[PDB]
Amino acid sequence: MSLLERLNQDMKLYMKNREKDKLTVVRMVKASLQNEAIKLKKDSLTEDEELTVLSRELKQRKDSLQEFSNANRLDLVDKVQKELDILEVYLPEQLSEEELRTIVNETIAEVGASSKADMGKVMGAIMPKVKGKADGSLINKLVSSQLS
């Protein structure tokens, strides 16, 4: 079953079992996946492209939670937290920044990289290990920073 078939199935399940918070997250994520394919003018996305969208949806919410915390709107912090709890069910286990840094170092080490001229080689070797487990921005960021 594809990601979209899964989301559609869950939409029905949450409508039936009256899980409003779950339903909202599910249809919002579905829409983002559909909008990305529309942007690229194609029927659907590759599975890696879907992972990028899911990671982006997760990051947007993590960023919002922090902003609502800054604003002292704990009711909104709680709402976004619930969305994260729901969304994580559709993604592979997430890597903590420390866990990601470890992988960045491990990959740079094994492929013999040292400078940014080696970025391409490091990114190609690291993606299989981290796609969908951390936000693309952070991955590129940590790799670049560790390279001279």
UniProtKB/Swiss-Prot annotation:
SUPFAM superfamilies according to UniProt: GatB/YqeY motif (SSF89095)
Top-rank taxon: Bacteria
One GO molecular-function entry: carbon-nitrogen ligase activity, with glutamine as amido-N-donor
Disulfide pattern: none
The name this protein goes by in its record: Uncharacterized protein YqeY
